[PDB]
Each structure stands twice: as structure tokens, then as C-alpha cells.
Design a protein around this ligand. Structure first.
Ligand code: NAG
Ligand code: NAG
Ligand code: NAG
Ligand code: NAG
Lengths: 82, 224, 311
């Protein structure tokens, strides 16, 4: 049964077992297809299945100080479905 | 009021075209129940180790005494198929019951009220919610206030004036870099610091951060 | 302490019932869909564990960072903030929690969770940094900075005590807080029975499912290679069918009880997710919902398959 995908071309050992046919990249993105143990895969790329460690969100440092406050000067009314 | 009404009317338009573009939670309970019935029906054609899965082709073929042991295998496998289906329906019904209890309390607390429970009635501060009917479900449109366009200010716990520590009644003390004001906390609206938007407690020594601004008194200017 | 997930176990019912035997496999086909319906059920349990974990911890969009200067008005968070010096960027109290809590060849397996413990520690550190630097504001919209003593003064107004009662007592309040955190840290060095019971129940169930392979169910032997070695085919089949029926009933029992456990873990995860929104991203007026006494604030800490709230 199918001798392609036995190949050494794109092979990546993961804690989820052995992944074949996906290009491992040093970048991070939001999870598209979940593989497991922090790894996800996507077509985002002349285009290929990539595999990556997922990003959890944009990193942010709050401008905290013992005498600084931020106050809103406007608002948005928003409507959201559940 | 015009701006708030336009933001609301615009946001309803976004819902309307987003639904015109999903209802995956309502669809997947329909899919699960259809798949379970389709499986229950398909079990009938399996043999369970009998010579066939068709009762008449047992009965028209065998003597009754040998038919009994062939039939008894079909009884057993069918009974087990049915019993499996009913058990999974009981478990899935308990999940729908939990979802209906959530929807019922969500209607009392978000539609018949205004909720202070964070994230219970959508993201941001809850204003109100509207129900819409859906097949085997409900949709809530939650309306919320989201604060926008922050500015930085310097701030202080208290003002020291006449050797007394003054605290804001509702707001916070803020400075634009040269002047001090008191503002409500969720929307910048600076006002003159006075005896009438502050209260006093003790002298200036105990509070960790405290600043020497004046406090105005609106009953001082009168001459008689 | 609340459990949030359970181990993502999975079983190939064909290898469990039959091992290598094609003879057993061709008999098992006579029972129709049962082995497909069982795999569908276990994979349904498994994807729900990642959903449970995501709904508890992934409540923040930004990964908020603490400032480098810990000027929180005398309150000391060092025991709850992450240690940068450890191999895992994990809290002192989270390391302490992760120390307290404690077959494959039969077609049993364990799938890994989607988020690692490193990622769950990242999310809880972001929730800590959000609350400590910005109060409840990061729950409603953008994080707005506020000085920590002024945030605690709002929380006093929230329980119906005037702000001056905080500022006049700030030294005492910070000392009582710092001491109470130290007392938790000592107490945890002594239990996590809520989490350990979920581990024990699942281990007891897998252990039983393995033990049932040794039962003969009235067949000549429980080793189907021994049956198939001693008897010719028409007599081997009636023996193998006794093992097939006993092993099917054993799997069916196991999968039914895993569906029932998953439902109460789902309820516990929905409670934990609610409790994070209402007790961590806000101040709650619901009596006893966020610990006993009037609620000021609370801090999440990760634990193996669970969450700990410091109320
Ligand atoms: C508030 O937001 C609306 C919509 O962007 C804008 O039209 C209005 O001018 C803003 N007002 C202020 C004071 O920024
Ligand atoms: C507040 O001031 C800090 C320091 O200058 C800056 O990093 C931050 O972006 C400012 N925030 C706003 C809302 O202007
Ligand atoms: C602060 O506000 C007062 C309002 O009258 C104004 O006169 C002053 O110029 C403002 N200072 C700055 C730095 O904006
Ligand atoms: C505040 O005012 C009092 C009275 O003039 C003075 O003793 C004190 O040093 C002042 N403190 C500051 C920080 O200006």
C-alpha cells in the first residue's frame, strides 16, 4: 500500500509519532490543523503542507508604573452572536 | 445618542451579512442523531454468526428446532444493537439537557435583565441581549459596550489640601501634566476637584502616594 | 482545585479482540459496525479534552508580560509569577503542584494533548500579568494600566468598604497577603485528591480492560493462537466466537463508562472556564463562588490535567 510517503524527502519525528510529507519551519502561526504536543500543520506558503510549533497570541507588555493610568476617551457598541 | 444608535444599527448589519455568508453547533447534533439511526438500521443486515440476516430465509429453510438457535443469534445481536443505541441517546440527551438549562438561565439573566457576570452575555460590558429562534436551538444577539481610544495620564491615590487627605467619591484623580482633575473611570470626562466630588479622611501623612493640589469649595465665593 | 481534562486514551478494537488472527477478523466482521462505532466514541472523547483545555486557558488574545520592576505597592507575587531560571517557565507554586500528582502492545494507546504544559504555563502567566497590571480591564477590551494599590482600592469599593480603608492600612493589607501566600506554599509542601482520583479511575479502567484478555469466557483457552493451534477450523470457530463475544462485551462496558466520565469532566471544565471569567477576569458578587468571605480577586495556576485558583 502506497510506496510514496515512505520517502526521506520531508520527514519529521514528533511526540505525536512520525510525520511524513510536511515541511517543518522555524516560524510560528495560529493552529490550523492540530497534530499534537504543540505542533500544527497548514497549507500557508509554490505551496506546501508546513508544520510548526503554534503561537499562543501576540506578545504584549503593559506600560505599568506606580503612578500611570490609561482612561478610555471613546467607545464601541458591539453586537455578537451566541 | 446619534453616534450610539448608528454604531448599533451598523453592527446589526454586520450580523445580517455574516449570516448571509456558521451554525455548526446546531448542524452537528442533527448529524450525530442521523448517523446513529443510520447505524442502527444498518445493523439489521449483519449475521451475528447466524446462517443469514433475514428471518424468513431462516424460517423457510430450516426445521423449527434448528431455526431456534439461528433465530436466537439474531435476537441477541439485534437486542445488543438496540441497547447500544438507546444508551448513547441517553448520554447525548443529558448533554442537550445541560445546554437547554444554560440557554434558559442565559435568557433570564441576559434578556430579562442586565448581567454583571463577566463574559456570560458576550465580550465587554453587557448592555442587553435579544433572542432569535433557530431550528432546535436559540441565538442570542448580545449588545455590549467596549471602551476605545485610551489616553495615558498620571494619577494619585489622594489629594492633600489644608493638611487633610481627600479621596474621589466615584472617579479617579488624573493629571494632563499641569492640572489635576477627577474623572469617571470608564470614560474620560475631567472635572474640577472640589469638596463635592471628593471626601476626606485623616491627615496627609499615612497615604503612600499623595499630591498637594488645591481642592475648590463652591460655597466659598458667596458674600452673605 | 478543578479537573479540566483526562488522558486521551484510544483502543483499536480489532487488535484488542483478535490480535494478528485473520480468522478472528473474518468472524468479527459478522457483528457488523460495532468496532467502527467504538472508535467513533473514543475519538469523540479525545477531541473534547483539547476543547476543555482551550475553553479554560485560552481566554486571552494577547500574551501579556509583567514589567521588570515589581513595584506592586508592597504585594509580593514571586511565588505565583513564573521562574525565568527553570527549564520550564513555570511558577514556584506550579512546580510544587506538578510534583504532588503521581499495555500498548494490546492495541491500547495514549495520544498527547494539543497544548503542552509549557503552553498552559504561558497562558496562566499571561492571565496573571493581565490582572496584576490592568485589573479587570483586559477582560472587557484592551488592557488599561493602573497602579496596583489603586486597583485594590476599587476592589474594596466593590465589597462595600471605602478606598481610604485600604490606603490607611496598605502596609498591613500587603503583609497579610504576603503571609497568606507563604502559608499556601507551606501547605502544598505537606492534597490534590480531586485530580489524583481522575487519574486513579482511568488507570483502574484500563487495568481492568487488559485483565479481561486473560478470561476464557467458557472457551478452551484465552490465548487464541493456542485455540487455533489445537483445533481444526470448524471447531476452532465455535471457540473463537466465545472469546469474540466476551471481548466485545468488555470493550462495550469500558467505552460506556468512559462516555459517562467524560460528561462529568466536561461539566467540571465548564465550571472552571466560568470560574476563570468571573473570578479572575472580574470581581464576583456571587456568594461562595470565588472562595469564602467577600471576593477581592483570584489567580490561576496550572496543574496536571487541572487548574488551581488562589481566591
Ligand atoms: C468616537 O468614535 C467615532 C467612530 O469612530 C468617531 O466618529 C468620533 O469622532 C469619536 N470621537 C472622539 C472624541 O474620538
Ligand atoms: C503610555 O505611555 C507609555 C510610555 O511612554 C507608552 O509605551 C504607551 O504606548 C502609552 N500608551 C498610550 C495609550 O498612549
Ligand atoms: C491641562 O488642562 C487645562 C484645562 O484648562 C489647560 O489649561 C492646560 O493647558 C492643560 N495642560 C496640558 C499640558 O495639556
Ligand atoms: C506638600 O505641602 C506641605 C505644606 O506646604 C509641605 O510640607 C510638603 O513638603 C509638600 N510635599 C510635596 C511633595 O510637595
Amino acid at each position: 500500500t502506497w510506496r510514496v510517503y515512505s520517502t526521506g524527502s520531508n520527514v519529521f519525528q514528533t511526540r505525536a509519532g512520525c510525520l511524513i510529507g510536511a515541511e517543518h519551519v522555524n516560524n510560528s502561526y495560529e493552529c490550523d490543523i492540530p497534530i499534537g504536543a504543540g505542533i500544527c500543520a497548514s497549507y500557508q506558503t509554490s505551496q506546501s503542507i508546513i508544520a510548526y510549533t503554534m503561537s499562543l497570541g501576540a506578545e504584549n507588555s503593559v506600560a505599568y508604573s506606580n503612578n500611570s493610568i490609561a482612561i478610555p476617551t471613546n467607545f464601541t457598541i458591539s453586537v455578537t452572536t451566541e | 445618542q446619534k453616534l450610539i444608535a448608528n454604531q448599533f444599527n451598523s453592527a446589526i448589519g454586520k450580523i445580517q451579512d455574516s449570516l448571509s455568508s456558521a451554525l455548526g453547533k446546531l448542524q452537528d447534533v442533527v448529524n450525530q442523531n442521523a448517523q446513529a439511526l443510520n447505524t442502527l438500521v444498518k445493523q439489521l443486515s449483519s449475521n451475528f454468526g447466524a446462517i443469514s440476516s433475514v428471518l424468513n430465509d431462516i424460517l423457510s429453510r430450516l426445521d423449527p428446532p434448528e431455526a431456534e438457535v439461528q433465530i436466537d443469534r439474531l435476537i441477541t445481536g439485534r437486542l445488543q444493537s438496540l441497547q447500544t443505541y438507546v444508551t448513547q441517546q441517553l448520554i447525548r440527551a443529558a448533554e442537550i439537557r445541560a445546554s437547554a438549562n444554560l440557554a434558559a438561565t442565559k435568557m433570564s439573566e441576559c434578556v430579562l435583565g442586565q448581567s454583571k457576570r463577566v463574559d456570560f452575555c458576550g465580550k465587554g460590558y453587557h448592555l442587553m441581549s435579544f433572542p432569535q429562534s433557530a431550528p432546535h436551538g436559540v441565538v442570542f444577539l448580545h449588545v455590549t459596550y467596549v471602551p476605545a481610544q485610551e489616553k495615558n495620564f498620571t494619577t494619585a491615590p489622594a489629594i492633600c489640601h489644608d493638611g487633610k487627605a481627600h479621596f474621589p467619591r466615584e472617579g479617579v484623580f488624573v493629571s494632563n501634566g499641569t492640572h489635576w482633575f477627577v474623572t469617571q473611570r470608564n470614560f474620560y470626562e475631567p472635572q474640577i476637584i472640589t469638596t463635592d466630588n471628593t471626601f476626606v479622611s485623616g491627615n496627609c501623612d499615612v497615604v503612600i502616594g499623595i499630591v498637594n493640589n488645591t481642592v475648590y469649595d463652591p460655597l466659598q465665593p458667596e458674600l452673605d | 482545585i478543578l479537573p479540566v481534562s483526562m488522558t486521551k486514551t484510544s483502543v483499536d478494537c480489532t487488535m484488542y479482540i483478535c490480535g494478528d488472527s485473520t480468522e478472528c477478523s473474518n468472524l468479527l466482521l459478522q457483528y457488523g459496525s460495532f468496532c467502527t462505532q467504538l472508535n467513533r466514541a473514543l475519538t469523540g472523547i479525545a477531541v473534547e479534552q483539547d476543547k476543555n483545555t482551550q475553553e479554560v486557558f485560552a481566554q486571552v488574545k494577547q500574551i501579556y508580560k509583567t514589567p521588570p520592576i515589581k513595584d506592586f505597592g508592597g504585594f509580593n507575587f514571586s511565588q505565583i509569577l513564573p521562574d525565568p531560571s527553570k527549564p520550564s517557565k513555570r511558577s514556584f507554586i506550579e512546580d510544587l503542584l506538578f510534583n504532588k500528582v503521581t499495555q500498548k502492545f494490546n492495541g491500547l494507546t495514549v495520544l498527547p494533548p494539543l497544548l503542552t504544559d509549557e503552553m498552559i504555563a504561558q497562558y496562566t502567566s499571561a492571565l496573571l500579568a493581565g490582572t496584576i497590571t490592568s485589573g479587570w480591564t483586559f477582560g472587557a477590551g484592551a488592557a488599561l494600566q493602573i497602579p496596583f494599590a489603586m486597583q485594590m482600592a476599587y476592589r474594596f469599593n466593590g465589597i462595600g468598604v471605602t478606598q481610604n480603608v485600604l490606603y490607611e492600612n496598605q502596609k498591613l493589607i500587603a503583609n497579610q497577603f504576603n503571609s497568606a501566600i507563604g502559608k499556601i506554599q507551606d501547605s502544598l509542601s505537606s492534597a490534590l485528591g480531586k485530580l489524583q482520583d481522575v487519574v486513579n479511575q482511568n488507570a483502574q479502567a484500563l487495568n481492568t480492560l487488559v485483565k479481561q484478555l486473560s478470561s476464557n469466557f467458557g472457551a478452551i483457552s484465552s490465548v487464541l493462537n493456542d485455540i487455533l493451534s489445537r483445533l481444526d477450523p470448524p471447531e476452532a470457530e465455535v471457540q473463537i466466537d466465545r472469546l469474540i463475544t466476551g471481548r466485545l462485551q468488555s470493550l462495550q462496558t469500558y467505552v460506556t463508562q468512559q462516555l459517562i466520565r467524560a460528561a462529568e469532566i466536561r461539566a467540571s471544565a465548564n465550571l472552571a472556564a466560568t470560574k476563570m471569567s468571573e473570578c479572575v477576569l472580574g470581581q464576583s458578587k456571587r456568594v461562595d463562588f470565588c472562595g469564602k468571605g467577600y471576593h477581592l480577586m483570584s489567580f490561576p495556576q496550572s496543574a496536571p490535567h487541572g487548574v488551581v485558583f488562589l481566591h
